[PDB]
Scaffold this active site. Structure first.
Site, PDB file in Angstrom:
ATOM      1  N   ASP A   1       6.067  12.863  10.012  1.00 23.07           N
ATOM      2  CA  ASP A   1       6.825  12.970   8.770  1.00 23.07           C
ATOM      3  C   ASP A   1       6.062  13.913   7.843  1.00 23.07           C
ATOM      4  O   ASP A   1       5.119  13.505   7.165  1.00 23.07           O
ATOM      5  CB  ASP A   1       7.019  11.595   8.123  1.00 23.07           C
ATOM      6  CG  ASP A   1       7.882  11.644   6.867  1.00 23.07           C
ATOM      7  OD1 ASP A   1       8.000  12.722   6.248  1.00 23.07           O
ATOM      8  OD2 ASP A   1       8.436  10.590   6.490  1.00 23.07           O
TER       9      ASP A   1
ATOM     10  N   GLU B   1      -0.787   3.738   1.964  1.00 20.43           N
ATOM     11  CA  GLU B   1       0.621   4.053   2.104  1.00 20.43           C
ATOM     12  C   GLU B   1       1.341   2.746   2.421  1.00 20.43           C
ATOM     13  O   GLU B   1       1.651   2.467   3.574  1.00 20.43           O
ATOM     14  CB  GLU B   1       0.830   5.102   3.198  1.00 20.43           C
ATOM     15  CG  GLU B   1       2.164   5.830   3.137  1.00 20.43           C
ATOM     16  CD  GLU B   1       3.223   5.178   3.998  1.00 20.43           C
ATOM     17  OE1 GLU B   1       3.789   4.148   3.571  1.00 20.43           O
ATOM     18  OE2 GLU B   1       3.484   5.695   5.106  1.00 20.43           O
TER      19      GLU B   1
ATOM     20  N   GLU C   1       8.126  -5.240   4.069  1.00 22.25           N
ATOM     21  CA  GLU C   1       6.853  -5.441   4.780  1.00 22.25           C
ATOM     22  C   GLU C   1       5.812  -6.133   3.899  1.00 22.25           C
ATOM     23  O   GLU C   1       4.807  -6.636   4.404  1.00 22.25           O
ATOM     24  CB  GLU C   1       6.289  -4.114   5.307  1.00 22.25           C
ATOM     25  CG  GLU C   1       7.244  -3.358   6.225  1.00 22.25           C
ATOM     26  CD  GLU C   1       6.711  -2.002   6.649  1.00 22.25           C
ATOM     27  OE1 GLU C   1       5.492  -1.892   6.919  1.00 22.25           O
ATOM     28  OE2 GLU C   1       7.514  -1.043   6.706  1.00 22.25           O
TER      29      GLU C   1
ATOM     30  N   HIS D   1      11.052   9.409   6.705  1.00 19.06           N
ATOM     31  CA  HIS D   1      11.314   8.335   7.654  1.00 19.06           C
ATOM     32  C   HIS D   1      11.758   7.058   6.930  1.00 19.06           C
ATOM     33  O   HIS D   1      12.128   6.074   7.570  1.00 19.06           O
ATOM     34  CB  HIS D   1      10.080   8.077   8.525  1.00 19.06           C
ATOM     35  CG  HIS D   1       8.974   7.355   7.821  1.00 19.06           C
ATOM     36  ND1 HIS D   1       8.106   7.983   6.954  1.00 19.06           N
ATOM     37  CD2 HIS D   1       8.584   6.059   7.869  1.00 19.06           C
ATOM     38  CE1 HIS D   1       7.235   7.103   6.489  1.00 19.06           C
ATOM     39  NE2 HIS D   1       7.504   5.929   7.031  1.00 19.06           N
TER      40      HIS D   1
HETATM   41  N1  LIG Z   1       6.667   2.062   6.401  1.00 19.62           N
HETATM   42  C1  LIG Z   1       5.411   2.426   6.352  1.00 19.62           C
HETATM   43  N2  LIG Z   1       5.062   3.821   6.413  1.00 19.62           N
HETATM   44  N3  LIG Z   1       4.369   1.427   6.234  1.00 19.62           N
HETATM   45  C2  LIG Z   1       2.919   1.862   6.184  1.00 19.62           C
HETATM   46  C3  LIG Z   1       2.471   2.292   7.568  1.00 19.62           C
HETATM   47  N4  LIG Z   1       1.024   2.150   7.834  1.00 19.62           N
HETATM   48  C4  LIG Z   1       0.214   3.171   7.162  1.00 19.62           C
HETATM   49  C5  LIG Z   1      -0.561   3.984   8.181  1.00 19.62           C
HETATM   50  C6  LIG Z   1      -1.560   5.016   7.586  1.00 19.62           C
HETATM   51  N5  LIG Z   1      -1.710   4.810   6.184  1.00 19.62           N
HETATM   52  C7  LIG Z   1      -1.110   6.426   7.849  1.00 19.62           C
HETATM   53  O1  LIG Z   1      -0.651   7.129   6.908  1.00 19.62           O
HETATM   54  O2  LIG Z   1      -1.189   6.917   9.036  1.00 19.62           O
HETATM   55  C8  LIG Z   1       0.528   0.746   7.544  1.00 19.62           C
HETATM   56  C9  LIG Z   1      -0.799   0.471   8.287  1.00 19.62           C
HETATM   57  O3  LIG Z   1      -1.653  -0.344   7.459  1.00 19.62           O
HETATM   58  C10 LIG Z   1      -1.913  -1.604   8.152  1.00 19.62           C
HETATM   59  N6  LIG Z   1      -1.781  -2.896   7.455  1.00 19.62           N
HETATM   60  C11 LIG Z   1      -0.673  -3.523   6.993  1.00 19.62           C
HETATM   61  N7  LIG Z   1      -1.045  -4.693   6.396  1.00 19.62           N
HETATM   62  C12 LIG Z   1      -2.393  -4.797   6.466  1.00 19.62           C
HETATM   63  C13 LIG Z   1      -3.327  -5.742   6.034  1.00 19.62           C
HETATM   64  N8  LIG Z   1      -2.864  -6.966   5.326  1.00 19.62           N
HETATM   65  N9  LIG Z   1      -4.645  -5.539   6.265  1.00 19.62           N
HETATM   66  C14 LIG Z   1      -5.055  -4.435   6.909  1.00 19.62           C
HETATM   67  N10 LIG Z   1      -4.175  -3.493   7.340  1.00 19.62           N
HETATM   68  C15 LIG Z   1      -2.856  -3.659   7.132  1.00 19.62           C
HETATM   69  C16 LIG Z   1      -0.877  -1.675   9.263  1.00 19.62           C
HETATM   70  O4  LIG Z   1      -1.366  -2.400  10.414  1.00 19.62           O
HETATM   71  C17 LIG Z   1      -0.599  -0.265   9.575  1.00 19.62           C
HETATM   72  O5  LIG Z   1      -1.511   0.201  10.505  1.00 19.62           O
END
Ligand SMILES: N=C(N)NCCN(CC[C@H](N)C(=O)O)C[C@H]1O[C@@H](n2cnc3c(N)ncnc32)[C@H](O)[C@@H]1O
Ligand SMILES: N=C(N)NCCN(CC[C@H](N)C(=O)O)C[C@H]1O[C@@H](n2cnc3c(N)ncnc32)[C@H](O)[C@@H]1O
Ligand SMILES: N=C(N)NCCN(CC[C@H](N)C(=O)O)C[C@H]1O[C@@H](n2cnc3c(N)ncnc32)[C@H](O)[C@@H]1O
Ligand SMILES: N=C(N)NCCN(CC[C@H](N)C(=O)O)C[C@H]1O[C@@H](n2cnc3c(N)ncnc32)[C@H](O)[C@@H]1O
Lengths: 361, 343, 343, 361
Positions: free
Chosen positions: C31, C123, C132, C280
């Site tokens: 994205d 993010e 979420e 996305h």
């Molecule tokens: N719809 C969405 N985009 N959503 C966002 C997409 N990801 C962001 C990914 C990163 N920041 C990037 O830009 O690649 C989310 C990532 O952060 C982790 N996570 C969620 N809750 C957590 C928690 N209580 N503790 C630790 N990690 C957590 C998730 O497991 C996941 O790996």
């Protein structure tokens, strides 16, 4: 039974069969101006309804009774002669208003109400206000109204104005001239041409039009429903004197109507004028048998006489004469059988309504 | 008197009042297929009319009587119950045919004729052929028919076929869904939605359509006017078994009809099929409240039962089933109140 | 742990299993608007990161930590609860950043950090921003933030607007009408149609649309991540009053969101508005079970209430009313089970 | 409960939450082959049901129970663990079958039936038959089956065949090579390329294909549900020896399945083969990590081993060798996380399958 003596059985059967259809109720309910204006009128004048006894004459689906219920009425008697009464009862049941709304199946001229009411509500207006002759039932219902009681609507205005529409006028002969041919599949039809022309002109035309076809400011005839008696609507004589604003040929008279809800807080108007958004009443035009030439400043004087008949409608007699010239025209029409001409196309103004060059813009 | 016993007066009054208008006669006459096919049928079979006595049941403007006169009839008794009868005579005189065309005002069930006739002519077909129940008058008129007389038209075909038309179905469902509103200006209408769906779907849809919406070859039901009795039209049971040519949703049954003029010289057909030029009869479609899924090769079996009512029309009951799955649909339609969908 | 008390185990297991897949990381990284806007926001505000201590909440692949390292951060603690944490570490080593990026496996609600941080990056936005419930983790992480610390993103906009879309409504109604069948293979399903309509309409529709379907300028609900408490997100009440610009049927409410990175040098915005390039997150639409008619000039007032549930999502109740007519609509949506309509 | 012991709670919760949705029931019901074949199987074998006691394992909407009722069943116990059970009971009531169908909410491993049954019906097949591990519940339910009762379906056939599909194989590297770039926004992703490739190849591919991609006649593995025990499905070893009909690169194994309803009147087959009309099961393909070159006449021998896991699915181990060359390939797949590749496009045959000039035509 006041109703049956003034109404042909054949007409009444089909009339109330017609209103037994949910689709027609839907058609009227989906007229946002009508329904919205009634709702605005009832709720904006809540002090006229709150803890009051209400009579709904011809409740149909019951919508106005529900509006009355919203305004805080203590008791609403909802009278309905068609089978719709059974559907209205269902809605009362499902909206948990059985303690407040009581559906009475039957004609208001024939049913028994247990008590006097503080206010009567109804939507009894037809084409040209008076068509269907339900206004007489509306006025008849005042036998149940307390002194100094109110009527919603309180007054009704019918408007008259001369118009020019060469195409509409010519259309009748274009249609009638079908019969003016010596060998339609070997048959000479010409002898019936006059009869065909006659038939077409007796039909009022239901549709809308551009206001610039109007040749004079309208004349108004007012019925005050608080003051009027039933008999007042059996013979309606509307004299007119038009001061012509435009020169040209007058092909007939245009008809529309307004009603007013005069409450304690405010007066609310429902208008079917051609200057206002279109309603399911549209407007009605009655042609003269022969057009009348009138110059701006001339006066077009005459009478529109509406004579009630037993088909729940009116025979329309129009006589008009140009006072300055003596040019005279008359027509007699059967309002029960109007011609629905509306097509959805935006109406065009008369040519030439351009006072400045259209190409300079 | 027949007719009065099978017809509510209220309906008949409006009915004959309707046909007293010149504009409707004009509208029917201006149906070129109809009038031209009738004239062609009558004139090309002139020998069935030549020096014959003719009965025109419901002459209207008198047009068919004039066609009969052109074909060489000796005398034509033209029966008409509406006020149009007054106009027909005017045309008879202005066309100098008073020696051959005799207008008899009144209902064919009630008038007296001076003699038996060699042939009966009429145009009694309504929507789905049977609407208006004039066919009963047409058959009734055979009391004036000679043992070896003829009828123009001679036979009638009513055709049935399943169709698919998602747009029409949802179009009707959208209308019925008005009553689904939980708060129309604050009012819950939902309680009446079931009644609303029933009312809307009870309306036969009058219009035309592309034949590619048909999902099977049509089934034909024939009425032989020479053999049929009046009583036969009080209850019409039309069984059907369609072998589906295409897979898909069956939203209902499409109806059209043919009539045949079987003369001595040739047989002439008048068809309201969707493959032929449009007539004022268009075609009629009866919707199921819920469509039936069928695959190519499946059989759709059932019955269309028509019960005559006192309003000069029919209560229509259609039951249809996919034999392979037991998927079943039933519907009741009121032919007196059709939905005119055309343009 | 704050996390476990608000989350059923099944949901958490499925949630973190989901983000353990490289294909999803690829999906998000590809994205370009998202990744590029984050990188731009961080790098254009490099002084907010230069020689600072950073916390990356839910680092996933680690990309934002790498952006922070590029911006000159002294040390970045990258917290990740899924197995992706093991992949992030591989990237840290192969990019020679072991001295600056420290991956800490576990939930941010449960891990121990060696020191307080100057800035938190994350993010955490889902569909309609709040899906979420990661925003709560994001806010929870503020326990490690210095008094004068910053958050990237700093604020969030939720935008609402009424829309008209007959096609979508009919599309969803058509699916529910399956349960209207009186004889599916001989079985009457109708008793369940109400349950079916309700189920389909509780589905938020995730996709994009033309801005011309919007019938009034949007209403905004703003969350300030620097000021907000975790508890603030358990019950979110969004009142609205729309001044209708167009007349027509309102079929539901459209939702999108913005986030702003408020740095020392400049503010950078990330928007998922329908006027902007698609992300996305697309956009989200909530249908009314029955549409509301409104004229231009009317006001559409009501409330959108989000109640957090233990499946890491929200129960959404939307109530809307046309003030002038009293026409009222109410709906419940399960943000957990959206309908992905995008093609 | 035998169920809980073999299933992680998270999976079970998500699993039964999934089937609580009417839309999911609808999707399956609208699979005409499936539903129609079941109805045919039950009704055409009416003597297996008339006045019998029936058990419907995982009744969902209850449709199969209704088919059983149509066939003349005396009593139907319809067991359902998801909330769909609440909807099924509604349908039983509205179809006036409360006297014949008894919905039992709960897992078949956990509920109590009042009596033994004459026949068990169920639709427990998943992708490549074994996915979802519902077959074990189906077999478990045999504790309620009489010593001469029947099972519908009675047998299940799993078919395997080697295939060639260069594009499908290449897709995996095209997707994985995303990570093979030294500066994605300044970050070197290359170190994860191997892991990405591994992840993509562990996904079985769900879709359909032209049968001409198949390089040998299929090998069949049969489960007899009348004879099988639950434990038989924990470890499924499918040996194979394919005699290659076409020369080329074998990129993997294609899987599909049939089930047969062996009734007293006739045997009815439900097939998901690529030669038959498509079902919601489509077909499943498992890629080799490295393709194997084989000539027509060569033999490709090896093993497909399915090991059940607690996520209600299977770990798939495939090892294959070309006997004539010793060329060997192996792959490990997670059936729980398949790649849904189907797009609706008509599948293309392998190039070049033209043995005569296409221009003749
Ligand atoms: N719809 C969405 N985009 N959503 C966002 C997409 N990801 C962001 C990914 C990163 N920041 C990037 O830009 O690649 C989310 C990532 O952060 C982790 N996570 C969620 N809750 C957590 C928690 N209580 N503790 C630790 N990690 C957590 C998730 O497991 C996941 O790996
Ligand atoms: N042409 C028209 N304007 N039509 C307006 C549509 N309706 C109004 C419905 C309601 N007030 C609404 O606004 O929805 C009119 C309804 O009133 C009933 N009615 C007529 N005479 C009656 C009589 N003597 N006694 C009882 N009911 C009568 C009719 O049966 C019909 O159902
Ligand atoms: N659905 C239809 N097309 N229908 C055909 C339309 N007209 C056809 C007119 C003429 N035959 C022509 O072809 O022009 C039929 C005309 O015949 C009259 N009629 C009906 N029943 C009658 C009856 N028991 N007795 C006498 N007249 C009757 C009607 O009043 C009507 O005027
Ligand atoms: N991929 C698939 N096709 N899959 C088949 C789709 N359904 C078939 C439904 C029915 N036969 C119909 O045709 O609607 C399976 C339904 O059976 C239920 N089920 C599974 N294990 C159970 C268990 N131990 N105990 C009780 N119910 C169970 C599931 O909850 C699910 O509802």
């Amino acid at each position: 039974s006041v109703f049956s003596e003034r109404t042909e059985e054949s007409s009444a059967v089909q009339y109330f069969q017609f209103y037994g259809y949910l689709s027609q109720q839907q058609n009227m309910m989906q007229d946002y101006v009508r329904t919205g204006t009634y709702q605005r009128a009832i709720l904006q004048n809540h002090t006229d309804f709150k803890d009051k006894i209400v009579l709904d004459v011809g409740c149909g689906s019951g919508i106005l009774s529900f509006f009355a219920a919203q305004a805080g009425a203590r008791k609403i008697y909802a009278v309905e002669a068609s089978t719709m009464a059974q559907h209205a009862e269902v809605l009362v049941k499902s909206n948990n208003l059985t303690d407040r709304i009581v559906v009475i199946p039957g004609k208001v001229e024939e049913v028994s109400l247990p008590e006097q009411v503080d206010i009567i509500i109804s939507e009894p207006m037809g084409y040209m206000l008076f068509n269907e002759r339900m206004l007489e039932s509306y006025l008849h219902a005042k036998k149940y109204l307390k002194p100094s009681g109110n009527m919603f609507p309180t007054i009704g205005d019918v408007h008259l104005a001369p118009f020019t529409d060469e195409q509409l006028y010519m259309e009748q002969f274009t249609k009638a001239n079908f019969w003016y041919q010596p060998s339609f599949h070997g048959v000479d039809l010409s002898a019936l041409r006059g009869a065909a022309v006659d038939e077409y002109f007796r039909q009022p035309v239901v549709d809308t039009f551009d206001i610039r076809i109007l040749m004079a400011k309208s004349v108004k005839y007012t019925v005050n429903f608080l003051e009027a008696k039933e008999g007042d609507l059996h013979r309606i004589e509307i004299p007119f004197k038009f001061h012509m604003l435009h020169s040209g040929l007058v092909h007939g008279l245009a008809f529309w109507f307004d009603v007013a809800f005069i409450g304690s807080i405010m007066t609310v108007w429902l208008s079917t004028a051609p200057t206002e958004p279109l309603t399911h009443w549209y407007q009605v035009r009655c042609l003269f048998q022969s057009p009348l030439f009138a110059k701006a400043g001339d006066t077009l004087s005459g009478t529109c006489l509406l004579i009630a008949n037993k088909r729940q409608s009116y025979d329309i007699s129009i006589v008009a004469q140009v006072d300055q010239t003596g040019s005279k025209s008359s027509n007699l029409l059967d309002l029960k059988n109007p011609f629905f001409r509306y097509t959805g196309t935006t109406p065009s103004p008369p040519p030439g309504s351009h006072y400045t060059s259209p190409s300079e813009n």
